[PDB]
Coordinates of C-alpha atoms in Angstrom, one line a residue:
Chain A
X1 CA 153.4 112.1 135.5
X2 CA 152.4 109.0 133.7
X3 CA 149.7 110.9 131.8
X4 CA 150.2 113.4 129.0
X5 CA 146.8 114.8 129.8
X6 CA 146.0 116.5 133.1
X7 CA 143.2 114.8 135.1
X8 CA 141.0 117.9 134.4
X9 CA 141.8 117.6 130.7
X10 CA 140.9 113.9 130.8
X11 CA 137.5 114.8 132.3
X12 CA 136.9 117.4 129.6
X13 CA 137.8 115.0 126.9
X14 CA 135.3 112.4 128.2
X15 CA 132.7 115.1 128.2
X16 CA 133.7 116.1 124.7
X17 CA 133.2 112.5 123.5
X18 CA 129.6 112.7 124.5
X19 CA 129.0 116.3 123.4
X20 CA 130.6 115.8 120.0
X21 CA 128.5 112.7 119.3
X22 CA 125.2 114.1 120.6
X23 CA 125.7 117.5 118.8
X24 CA 127.1 115.9 115.6
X25 CA 125.5 112.4 115.5
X26 CA 126.2 112.2 111.8
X27 CA 129.7 111.0 112.9
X28 CA 128.0 107.7 114.0
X29 CA 126.6 107.3 110.5
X30 CA 130.0 107.9 108.9
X31 CA 131.5 105.4 111.3
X32 CA 128.9 102.8 110.4
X33 CA 129.6 103.4 106.7
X34 CA 133.3 102.9 107.4
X35 CA 132.4 99.7 109.3
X36 CA 130.4 98.6 106.3
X37 CA 133.2 99.3 103.9
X38 CA 135.6 97.2 105.9
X39 CA 132.9 94.4 106.0
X40 CA 132.6 94.5 102.3
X41 CA 136.4 94.1 102.0
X42 CA 136.6 91.3 104.5
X43 CA 133.7 89.4 103.1
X44 CA 134.7 90.0 99.5
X45 CA 135.1 86.4 98.4
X46 CA 131.8 85.3 100.1
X47 CA 130.1 88.1 98.1
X48 CA 131.6 87.6 94.6
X49 CA 133.4 84.2 94.5
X50 CA 130.8 81.8 95.9
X51 CA 130.2 79.2 93.2
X52 CA 127.0 78.2 95.0
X53 CA 125.5 81.7 94.5
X54 CA 123.5 82.1 91.3
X55 CA 124.6 84.7 88.8
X56 CA 122.6 86.6 86.2
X57 CA 124.7 87.9 83.3
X58 CA 128.2 87.4 81.9
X59 CA 130.7 85.4 84.0
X60 CA 133.3 87.8 82.6
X61 CA 131.4 90.9 83.7
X62 CA 133.6 93.7 84.8
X63 CA 131.1 95.0 87.3
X64 CA 129.1 92.6 89.6
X65 CA 126.2 93.7 91.7
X66 CA 125.2 91.5 94.7
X67 CA 121.5 91.4 95.2
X68 CA 120.4 90.4 98.7
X69 CA 116.8 89.6 98.2
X70 CA 113.7 87.7 99.4
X71 CA 111.1 86.0 97.2
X72 CA 108.3 87.1 99.6
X73 CA 109.5 90.7 99.7
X74 CA 107.2 92.9 97.7
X75 CA 109.7 95.6 96.6
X76 CA 112.2 92.8 95.9
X77 CA 109.7 91.4 93.3
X78 CA 109.4 94.8 91.7
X79 CA 113.1 95.7 91.8
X80 CA 114.5 92.4 90.5
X81 CA 113.3 93.1 86.9
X82 CA 115.2 96.3 87.0
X83 CA 118.4 94.6 88.1
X84 CA 118.0 92.0 85.3
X85 CA 117.3 94.8 82.8
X86 CA 120.7 96.4 83.7
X87 CA 122.4 93.2 82.6
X88 CA 120.6 93.4 79.3
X89 CA 121.4 97.0 78.6
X90 CA 124.9 96.8 80.1
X91 CA 126.5 93.4 79.1
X92 CA 129.5 94.2 81.2
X93 CA 127.3 94.1 84.3
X94 CA 126.3 90.9 86.1
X95 CA 124.2 90.3 89.2
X96 CA 124.8 87.7 91.9
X97 CA 121.7 86.6 93.7
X98 CA 121.8 86.1 97.5
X99 CA 118.4 84.7 98.6
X100 CA 117.4 85.4 102.2
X101 CA 114.8 83.7 104.5
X102 CA 113.7 86.9 106.1
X103 CA 109.9 86.6 105.6
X104 CA 109.7 83.1 107.0
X105 CA 109.4 79.4 106.1
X106 CA 108.3 79.8 102.5
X107 CA 111.1 82.2 101.8
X108 CA 113.6 79.6 103.0
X109 CA 111.8 76.9 100.9
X110 CA 111.8 79.1 97.8
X111 CA 115.5 79.9 98.3
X112 CA 116.3 76.2 98.8
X113 CA 114.6 75.6 95.5
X114 CA 116.5 78.1 93.4
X115 CA 119.8 77.3 95.1
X116 CA 119.3 73.5 94.5
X117 CA 118.5 74.2 90.8
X118 CA 121.5 76.4 90.4
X119 CA 123.9 73.6 91.7
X120 CA 122.3 70.8 89.6
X121 CA 121.6 72.9 86.5
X122 CA 122.8 76.6 86.5
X123 CA 121.1 77.4 83.2
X124 CA 117.8 76.4 84.6
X125 CA 117.9 78.8 87.6
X126 CA 116.8 82.0 86.0
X127 CA 113.4 80.8 84.9
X128 CA 112.5 79.6 88.5
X129 CA 114.0 82.8 90.1
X130 CA 111.8 84.9 87.8
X131 CA 108.7 82.8 88.3
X132 CA 109.0 83.0 92.1
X133 CA 109.5 86.8 91.9
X134 CA 106.5 87.5 89.7
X135 CA 104.2 85.4 91.9
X136 CA 101.6 87.7 93.3
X137 CA 100.9 85.6 96.4
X138 CA 102.8 84.8 99.6
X139 CA 104.6 81.6 98.7
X140 CA 103.7 78.2 100.2
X141 CA 104.7 74.6 99.6
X142 CA 102.0 74.2 96.9
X143 CA 102.8 77.4 95.1
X144 CA 106.6 76.7 95.1
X145 CA 105.9 73.3 93.7
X146 CA 103.8 74.9 91.0
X147 CA 106.6 77.3 90.2
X148 CA 109.0 74.4 89.7
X149 CA 106.6 72.5 87.6
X150 CA 105.9 75.6 85.6
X151 CA 109.6 76.1 84.9
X152 CA 110.4 72.4 84.2
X153 CA 112.5 72.2 87.4
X154 CA 110.2 69.9 89.4
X155 CA 112.6 67.0 88.8
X156 CA 115.3 68.7 90.9
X157 CA 115.4 67.8 94.6
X158 CA 115.7 70.4 97.3
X159 CA 118.9 69.6 99.1
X160 CA 120.0 70.1 102.7
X161 CA 123.3 71.4 101.2
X162 CA 121.4 74.3 99.7
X163 CA 120.2 75.2 103.2
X164 CA 123.8 75.7 104.1
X165 CA 124.3 78.1 101.3
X166 CA 121.2 79.9 102.4
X167 CA 122.6 80.0 106.0
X168 CA 125.8 81.5 104.6
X169 CA 123.8 84.2 102.8
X170 CA 122.1 85.0 106.1
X171 CA 125.4 85.1 108.1
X172 CA 126.8 87.3 105.3
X173 CA 123.9 89.7 105.4
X174 CA 124.4 90.1 109.2
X175 CA 128.2 90.7 108.9
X176 CA 127.4 93.5 106.3
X177 CA 124.8 95.0 108.7
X178 CA 121.9 94.3 106.3
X179 CA 118.6 94.1 108.1
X180 CA 116.2 94.7 105.1
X181 CA 115.6 93.7 101.5
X182 CA 116.3 94.4 98.8
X183 CA 119.9 95.3 99.6
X184 CA 122.2 95.7 96.6
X185 CA 126.0 95.9 96.8
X186 CA 127.3 98.1 94.0
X187 CA 131.1 98.6 94.1
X188 CA 131.9 100.1 97.5
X189 CA 128.2 101.1 98.2
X190 CA 125.3 99.1 99.7
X191 CA 122.1 100.3 98.2
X192 CA 119.3 100.1 100.7
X193 CA 115.8 99.3 99.2
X194 CA 114.5 99.5 95.7
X195 CA 115.2 102.4 93.4
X196 CA 113.7 103.4 90.0
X197 CA 115.6 102.2 86.9
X198 CA 117.1 105.6 86.0
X199 CA 118.7 106.1 89.4
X200 CA 120.0 102.5 89.4
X201 CA 121.3 103.2 85.8
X202 CA 123.1 106.3 87.1
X203 CA 124.7 104.5 90.0
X204 CA 126.0 101.6 88.0
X205 CA 127.4 104.0 85.4
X206 CA 129.2 105.9 88.2
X207 CA 130.8 102.5 89.2
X208 CA 131.4 101.5 85.5
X209 CA 133.4 104.7 85.1
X210 CA 135.7 103.4 87.9
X211 CA 136.9 100.3 86.0
Chain B
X1 CA 140.7 129.9 132.5
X2 CA 137.6 127.8 133.3
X3 CA 138.8 125.2 130.8
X4 CA 141.6 122.7 131.3
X5 CA 141.9 122.4 127.5
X6 CA 142.9 125.2 125.2
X7 CA 140.2 126.1 122.7
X8 CA 142.5 124.8 119.9
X9 CA 142.9 121.6 121.9
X10 CA 139.1 121.3 122.3
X11 CA 138.8 121.6 118.5
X12 CA 141.4 118.8 117.9
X13 CA 139.7 116.6 120.4
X14 CA 136.3 116.9 118.6
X15 CA 138.1 116.1 115.3
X16 CA 139.7 113.1 117.0
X17 CA 136.4 111.8 118.2
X18 CA 135.3 111.6 114.5
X19 CA 138.7 110.4 113.2
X20 CA 139.0 107.7 115.8
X21 CA 135.6 106.2 115.2
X22 CA 135.8 106.4 111.4
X23 CA 139.3 104.9 111.3
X24 CA 138.6 102.4 114.0
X25 CA 134.8 101.7 113.8
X26 CA 135.3 98.4 115.7
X27 CA 135.1 100.7 118.8
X28 CA 131.4 101.0 118.1
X29 CA 131.0 97.3 118.0
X30 CA 132.8 97.0 121.3
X31 CA 130.6 99.7 122.7
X32 CA 127.4 97.9 121.5
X33 CA 128.6 94.7 123.1
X34 CA 129.2 96.6 126.3
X35 CA 125.7 98.0 126.1
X36 CA 124.4 94.4 125.5
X37 CA 126.2 93.2 128.6
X38 CA 124.6 95.9 130.7
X39 CA 121.2 95.1 129.3
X40 CA 121.7 91.4 130.1
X41 CA 122.4 92.4 133.7
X42 CA 119.6 94.9 134.0
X43 CA 117.0 92.5 132.5
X44 CA 118.4 89.4 134.3
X45 CA 115.2 88.5 136.1
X46 CA 113.0 88.9 133.0
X47 CA 115.4 86.5 131.3
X48 CA 115.8 83.8 133.9
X49 CA 113.1 84.3 136.6
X50 CA 109.9 84.7 134.6
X51 CA 107.6 81.9 135.8
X52 CA 105.4 82.4 132.7
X53 CA 108.3 81.6 130.4
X54 CA 108.5 77.9 129.4
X55 CA 111.6 75.9 130.4
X56 CA 113.1 72.8 128.8
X57 CA 115.3 70.8 131.1
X58 CA 116.0 70.7 134.8
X59 CA 114.7 73.4 137.1
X60 CA 117.8 73.0 139.1
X61 CA 120.1 73.5 136.0
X62 CA 123.3 75.3 136.7
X63 CA 123.5 76.8 133.3
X64 CA 120.4 78.2 131.6
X65 CA 120.3 79.3 128.0
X66 CA 117.6 81.7 126.9
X67 CA 116.2 81.0 123.4
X68 CA 114.5 83.9 121.6
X69 CA 112.7 82.2 118.8
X70 CA 109.9 82.2 116.4
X71 CA 107.7 79.3 115.2
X72 CA 107.6 80.7 111.7
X73 CA 111.4 81.2 111.5
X74 CA 113.1 78.5 109.4
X75 CA 116.5 78.4 111.1
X76 CA 114.7 78.5 114.4
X77 CA 112.9 75.2 113.5
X78 CA 116.2 73.7 112.6
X79 CA 118.2 75.0 115.6
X80 CA 115.6 74.2 118.3
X81 CA 116.3 70.4 118.2
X82 CA 120.0 71.2 118.8
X83 CA 119.1 73.3 121.9
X84 CA 117.0 70.4 123.2
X85 CA 119.7 67.9 122.5
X86 CA 122.1 69.9 124.7
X87 CA 119.7 69.5 127.6
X88 CA 119.7 65.7 126.9
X89 CA 123.5 65.4 126.7
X90 CA 124.1 67.9 129.5
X91 CA 121.5 67.5 132.3
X92 CA 123.0 70.5 134.1
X93 CA 121.8 72.7 131.2
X94 CA 118.3 74.0 130.8
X95 CA 116.7 76.2 128.0
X96 CA 114.2 78.9 128.6
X97 CA 111.9 79.6 125.6
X98 CA 111.0 83.2 124.6
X99 CA 108.6 83.0 121.7
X100 CA 108.5 86.1 119.5
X101 CA 105.8 87.4 117.1
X102 CA 108.3 88.6 114.5
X103 CA 107.0 86.8 111.4
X104 CA 103.4 88.0 111.9
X105 CA 99.9 87.0 113.1
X106 CA 100.4 83.3 113.1
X107 CA 103.6 83.6 115.1
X108 CA 101.7 85.5 117.8
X109 CA 98.9 82.9 117.7
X110 CA 101.4 80.1 118.0
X111 CA 103.2 81.8 120.8
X112 CA 99.9 82.4 122.5
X113 CA 99.1 78.7 122.3
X114 CA 102.4 77.5 123.8
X115 CA 102.4 80.1 126.6
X116 CA 98.8 79.4 127.5
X117 CA 99.5 75.6 127.7
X118 CA 102.6 76.3 129.8
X119 CA 100.6 78.2 132.4
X120 CA 97.7 75.7 132.5
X121 CA 99.8 72.6 132.2
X122 CA 103.6 73.0 132.1
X123 CA 104.3 69.4 131.4
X124 CA 102.1 69.6 128.3
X125 CA 104.1 72.4 126.7
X126 CA 107.0 70.6 125.2
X127 CA 104.9 68.4 122.8
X128 CA 103.2 71.5 121.3
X129 CA 106.4 73.5 121.2
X130 CA 108.0 70.7 119.2
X131 CA 105.0 70.1 116.9
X132 CA 104.9 73.8 115.9
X133 CA 108.7 73.8 115.2
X134 CA 108.6 70.7 113.1
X135 CA 105.7 72.0 111.0
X136 CA 107.0 72.5 107.4
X137 CA 104.4 75.2 106.5
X138 CA 103.8 78.8 107.5
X139 CA 101.4 78.5 110.4
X140 CA 97.8 79.6 110.2
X141 CA 94.7 79.3 112.5
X142 CA 93.9 75.8 111.1
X143 CA 97.4 74.4 111.3
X144 CA 97.9 75.7 114.9
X145 CA 94.5 74.1 115.9
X146 CA 95.7 70.9 114.3
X147 CA 99.0 71.1 116.3
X148 CA 97.1 71.5 119.5
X149 CA 94.7 68.6 118.6
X150 CA 97.7 66.5 117.6
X151 CA 99.4 67.1 121.0
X152 CA 96.3 66.7 123.1
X153 CA 96.3 70.4 124.1
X154 CA 93.2 71.5 122.2
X155 CA 91.2 71.6 125.4
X156 CA 93.4 74.5 126.6
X157 CA 92.2 78.1 125.8
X158 CA 94.4 80.8 124.4
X159 CA 94.4 83.5 127.0
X160 CA 94.7 87.3 126.7
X161 CA 97.1 87.0 129.6
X162 CA 99.5 84.9 127.5
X163 CA 99.6 87.8 125.0
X164 CA 101.0 90.0 127.8
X165 CA 103.8 87.5 128.3
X166 CA 104.4 87.6 124.6
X167 CA 104.5 91.4 124.7
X168 CA 107.0 91.2 127.6
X169 CA 109.2 88.9 125.4
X170 CA 109.0 91.4 122.6
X171 CA 109.9 94.3 124.9
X172 CA 112.7 92.2 126.4
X173 CA 114.2 91.4 122.9
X174 CA 114.2 95.1 122.1
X175 CA 116.0 96.1 125.3
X176 CA 118.6 93.5 124.5
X177 CA 119.0 94.8 120.9
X178 CA 117.8 91.6 119.4
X179 CA 116.4 92.2 115.9
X180 CA 116.6 88.6 114.5
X181 CA 115.8 85.0 115.4
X182 CA 117.1 82.6 116.6
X183 CA 118.9 84.6 119.3
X184 CA 120.4 82.6 122.2
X185 CA 121.6 84.1 125.5
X186 CA 124.5 81.9 126.8
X187 CA 126.0 83.3 130.0
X188 CA 127.3 86.7 129.1
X189 CA 127.0 86.2 125.3
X190 CA 124.1 86.6 122.9
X191 CA 124.5 84.1 120.1
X192 CA 123.1 85.5 116.9
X193 CA 121.5 83.0 114.5
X194 CA 121.7 79.2 114.4
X195 CA 125.0 77.3 114.8
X196 CA 125.8 73.6 114.2
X197 CA 125.7 71.3 117.2
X198 CA 129.4 71.0 117.7
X199 CA 129.9 74.8 117.9
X200 CA 127.0 75.1 120.3
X201 CA 128.4 72.2 122.3
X202 CA 131.8 74.0 122.6
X203 CA 130.2 77.3 123.6
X204 CA 128.1 75.8 126.4
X205 CA 131.1 73.9 127.7
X206 CA 133.1 77.1 127.8
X207 CA 130.3 78.5 130.0
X208 CA 129.9 75.3 132.0
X209 CA 133.6 75.7 132.9
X210 CA 132.7 79.0 134.5
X211 CA 130.4 77.6 137.2
Chain C
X1 CA 154.0 123.0 116.3
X2 CA 151.0 122.7 114.0
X3 CA 149.1 120.7 116.7
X4 CA 147.6 122.1 119.9
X5 CA 147.8 118.6 121.4
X6 CA 151.1 116.8 122.1
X7 CA 151.4 113.5 120.2
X8 CA 151.2 111.7 123.6
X9 CA 148.0 113.7 124.4
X10 CA 146.6 112.7 121.0
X11 CA 147.2 109.1 121.8
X12 CA 145.5 109.4 125.1
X13 CA 142.5 111.1 123.5
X14 CA 142.1 108.3 121.0
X15 CA 142.2 105.8 123.9
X16 CA 139.7 107.9 125.8
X17 CA 137.2 107.8 122.9
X18 CA 137.2 104.0 123.2
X19 CA 137.2 103.9 127.0
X20 CA 134.5 106.5 127.3
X21 CA 132.1 104.7 124.9
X22 CA 132.8 101.2 126.2
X23 CA 132.5 102.3 129.9
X24 CA 129.5 104.6 129.2
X25 CA 127.8 103.1 126.1
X26 CA 124.6 105.0 127.1
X27 CA 126.3 107.9 125.2
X28 CA 125.6 105.9 121.9
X29 CA 121.9 105.7 122.9
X30 CA 121.8 109.4 123.5
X31 CA 123.5 110.1 120.2
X32 CA 121.0 107.9 118.3
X33 CA 118.1 109.7 119.9
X34 CA 119.7 113.0 118.8
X35 CA 120.0 111.5 115.3
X36 CA 116.4 110.5 115.5
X37 CA 115.4 114.0 116.6
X38 CA 117.2 115.5 113.6
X39 CA 115.6 113.0 111.3
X40 CA 112.1 113.9 112.6
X41 CA 112.9 117.6 111.9
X42 CA 114.3 117.0 108.4
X43 CA 111.4 114.6 107.4
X44 CA 108.7 116.7 109.0
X45 CA 106.7 117.4 105.9
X46 CA 106.8 113.7 104.7
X47 CA 105.5 112.9 108.2
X48 CA 102.7 115.4 108.6
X49 CA 102.0 117.0 105.3
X50 CA 101.7 114.1 102.8
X51 CA 98.2 114.4 101.3
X52 CA 98.4 110.8 100.2
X53 CA 98.8 109.6 103.8
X54 CA 95.4 108.7 105.5
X55 CA 94.4 110.6 108.6
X56 CA 92.1 109.6 111.5
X57 CA 90.6 112.5 113.3
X58 CA 90.2 116.2 112.8
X59 CA 92.2 117.9 110.0
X60 CA 92.5 120.9 112.3
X61 CA 94.0 118.8 115.1
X62 CA 96.6 120.5 117.2
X63 CA 98.5 117.3 118.0
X64 CA 99.1 114.7 115.2
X65 CA 100.5 111.3 116.0
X66 CA 102.1 109.4 113.1
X67 CA 101.4 105.6 113.2
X68 CA 103.9 103.5 111.3
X69 CA 102.1 100.2 111.2
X70 CA 101.5 96.9 109.4
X71 CA 98.2 95.1 108.8
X72 CA 99.9 91.7 109.4
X73 CA 101.6 92.9 112.6
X74 CA 99.8 91.3 115.6
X75 CA 100.5 94.1 118.2
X76 CA 99.7 96.7 115.5
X77 CA 96.2 95.2 115.3
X78 CA 95.8 95.4 119.0
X79 CA 97.3 98.9 119.3
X80 CA 95.4 100.6 116.5
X81 CA 92.1 100.6 118.4
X82 CA 93.9 102.4 121.2
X83 CA 95.2 105.1 118.8
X84 CA 91.7 105.6 117.4
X85 CA 90.2 105.8 120.9
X86 CA 92.6 108.7 121.7
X87 CA 91.1 110.6 118.7
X88 CA 87.6 109.9 120.2
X89 CA 88.5 111.0 123.7
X90 CA 90.7 113.9 122.6
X91 CA 89.2 115.6 119.5
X92 CA 92.3 117.8 119.3
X93 CA 94.3 114.7 118.5
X94 CA 94.6 113.2 115.0
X95 CA 96.5 110.1 113.8
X96 CA 98.2 109.8 110.4
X97 CA 98.5 106.2 109.2
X98 CA 101.8 105.1 107.5
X99 CA 101.2 101.5 106.3
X100 CA 104.4 99.5 105.8
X101 CA 105.1 96.3 103.8
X102 CA 107.3 94.7 106.5
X103 CA 105.6 91.3 106.8
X104 CA 105.6 90.6 103.1
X105 CA 103.5 90.5 100.0
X106 CA 100.0 90.6 101.6
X107 CA 101.1 93.6 103.8
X108 CA 102.0 95.5 100.6
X109 CA 98.7 94.5 98.9
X110 CA 96.7 95.5 102.0
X111 CA 98.5 98.9 102.2
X112 CA 98.0 99.4 98.5
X113 CA 94.3 98.8 99.1
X114 CA 93.9 101.4 101.9
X115 CA 96.0 104.0 100.1
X116 CA 94.1 103.6 96.9
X117 CA 90.8 104.0 98.7
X118 CA 92.1 107.1 100.6
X119 CA 93.0 108.8 97.3
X120 CA 89.8 108.0 95.5
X121 CA 87.4 108.3 98.5
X122 CA 89.1 109.5 101.8
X123 CA 85.9 109.0 103.9
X124 CA 85.8 105.4 102.8
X125 CA 89.3 104.6 104.1
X126 CA 88.6 104.1 107.8
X127 CA 86.2 101.2 107.4
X128 CA 88.8 99.2 105.3
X129 CA 91.7 100.2 107.6
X130 CA 89.7 98.8 110.6
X131 CA 88.5 95.7 108.8
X132 CA 92.1 94.7 107.8
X133 CA 93.3 95.3 111.4
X134 CA 90.6 93.2 113.1
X135 CA 91.2 90.3 110.7
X136 CA 92.5 87.4 112.7
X137 CA 94.4 85.7 109.9
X138 CA 97.5 86.5 107.9
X139 CA 96.1 88.4 104.9
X140 CA 96.1 87.0 101.3
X141 CA 94.6 88.2 98.0
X142 CA 91.3 86.5 98.8
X143 CA 91.0 87.9 102.3
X144 CA 91.9 91.4 101.2
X145 CA 89.3 91.2 98.5
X146 CA 86.8 90.1 101.1
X147 CA 87.7 93.0 103.3
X148 CA 87.1 95.4 100.4
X149 CA 83.8 93.8 99.6
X150 CA 82.8 93.8 103.2
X151 CA 83.5 97.6 103.5
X152 CA 81.9 98.5 100.2
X153 CA 85.3 99.5 98.7
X154 CA 85.6 96.6 96.2
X155 CA 84.8 99.0 93.3
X156 CA 88.1 100.9 94.0
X157 CA 91.1 99.8 91.9
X158 CA 94.5 99.2 93.5
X159 CA 96.8 101.7 91.8
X160 CA 100.5 101.6 91.0
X161 CA 100.6 105.1 92.3
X162 CA 99.6 103.9 95.8
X163 CA 102.7 101.6 95.6
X164 CA 104.8 104.8 95.4
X165 CA 103.2 106.2 98.5
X166 CA 103.9 102.9 100.2
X167 CA 107.5 103.1 99.0
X168 CA 107.8 106.6 100.4
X169 CA 106.5 105.3 103.8
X170 CA 109.2 102.6 103.7
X171 CA 112.0 105.1 102.8
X172 CA 110.6 107.4 105.6
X173 CA 110.7 104.6 108.2
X174 CA 114.3 103.9 107.3
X175 CA 115.4 107.5 107.5
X176 CA 113.8 107.6 111.0
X177 CA 115.6 104.4 112.0
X178 CA 112.4 102.5 112.5
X179 CA 112.9 98.7 112.1
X180 CA 109.8 97.5 113.9
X181 CA 106.0 98.1 114.1
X182 CA 104.0 99.6 115.6
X183 CA 106.1 102.7 115.8
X184 CA 104.4 105.9 116.8
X185 CA 105.7 109.5 116.4
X186 CA 104.4 111.6 119.2
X187 CA 105.8 115.1 119.2
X188 CA 109.5 114.8 119.5
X189 CA 109.4 111.2 120.6
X190 CA 109.2 107.9 118.6
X191 CA 107.3 105.4 120.7
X192 CA 108.5 101.9 120.0
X193 CA 106.0 99.1 120.1
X194 CA 102.4 99.0 121.5
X195 CA 101.6 100.4 124.9
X196 CA 98.5 100.1 127.1
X197 CA 95.9 102.9 126.7
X198 CA 96.6 104.6 130.1
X199 CA 100.3 105.0 129.2
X200 CA 99.5 106.3 125.7
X201 CA 96.9 108.6 127.3
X202 CA 99.6 110.0 129.6
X203 CA 102.2 110.5 126.8
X204 CA 99.7 112.3 124.5
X205 CA 98.7 114.6 127.5
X206 CA 102.3 115.4 128.2
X207 CA 102.5 116.5 124.5
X208 CA 99.1 118.3 124.6
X209 CA 100.5 120.4 127.5
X210 CA 103.2 121.6 125.1
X211 CA 100.8 123.3 122.7

């Protein structure tokens, strides 16, 4: 006929699609990882070549981690020093910061602050980034203003343009299927959540050995 | 035998389920969209015909957008004026508001406020909705109370019944697979995240041309 | 040849993988549930046998619910009394509490508080757990300190070790595919979101009848 399969065979194939996925649902996980790998490739320039995205470490770094993070995210605050320590112990490693507004208004405001500072004065970014991360309270307008005053960045205006960069980060995180912070792109892998320094150190080395 | 497929063929089919999804994981995306389309159809009356859900624009509107949103969500605040502007420029378009408690306690409180106002005095809803959206701070009990005082709605009690409407919105968002705000139902599409006015304007027109 | 399927049959099978999942996307839901069931089994000891995780009810309980929850989550606050009431009406039912830091810094701080109290003085945990849940405001350092003072637990230090327990809860929630609170493990089911007492009462009975 016009079909290579018999109708009875077609019916069994359809049943086998269900049975295979229900009995071996790990296939779905593998498929999602494959979808993530393709997303990393398609969004590569947004990840690594966005001039508006702050960078910690050498511009000439041979490995670049991409940190999707939130200044109001508790394990982001605790993980960020570990990311920065990698750049200190491994000069060939840099970290790109992708602030996200996940935890609400103050997160967006904080992100707007660091992104505006980065554009106006890149060298001044790190101090504010760190001050916001080490803050032990949920951020608000007053505390963010204090952070900028305390890092000598209070002269720098928060721009509407920086909110577009922030929106790009948000769109990027969605395209990569990231729905939690901290999320860290390391080579072909997206690390979900914080990890201790030794594990991070191992993972970056495994990726350093691939260059 | 009792099988249209040979055992060897069955084995290859199972392998092909995996290989097909891993090599072409876009199939999963298409399947999720199909699942979303079915969800929109099954939850149609909860979406469009819930009297307890506030509406912006004409009751006789031929196109109705459903805005899943959060008063503590930064890009919700910035996107909402665009949704309202559509109803001003396109009188045949209305917007149904589905407040969500995603960003925590104050979000629920704020939602409770607008939903309670809608039930007691529908015409009084819009002012409070707008005041809460334009608020530049993470909401709290005091700021929500100020919003109600500033919109002459402070006489209206927050009801436990409005918390049921809010719970319905939450359950609805889950059934639709919405895990982020703002999410906007436009015809057969669920728009993820905010978009600029011109893009929104194009999308609504494409849907207006289908009526 | 080396293939049980003809090439034309292979092509049709690949097409049928797509068509089956797009026409019957409920298969994906069933597959995810299967993946959840396997996750519950593999993470069983983290769920039920973590000494660092607070328990409400009898240690010798024959049914144990696992409550993934957040002190800044509005419907968590309203659902928790229902979970505790089950343990009062059904002494053979206990509830394990898994605090999560989803809503930000104060959530982590609050979780750190209850987990630190549990380890130092288990009997003192419940009062603080309840006080934090009944709090009508988004928590902050001051309000958390007040909660501890008001429950005679302010002598107990927040430990860095409790932050590891909290991180375990977070990792556990991810492995189980939980991306919202309250999430309640009941036997082989993961209940998403809050439910009224009568429905909860029915579900626990259905699981009680399986022991």
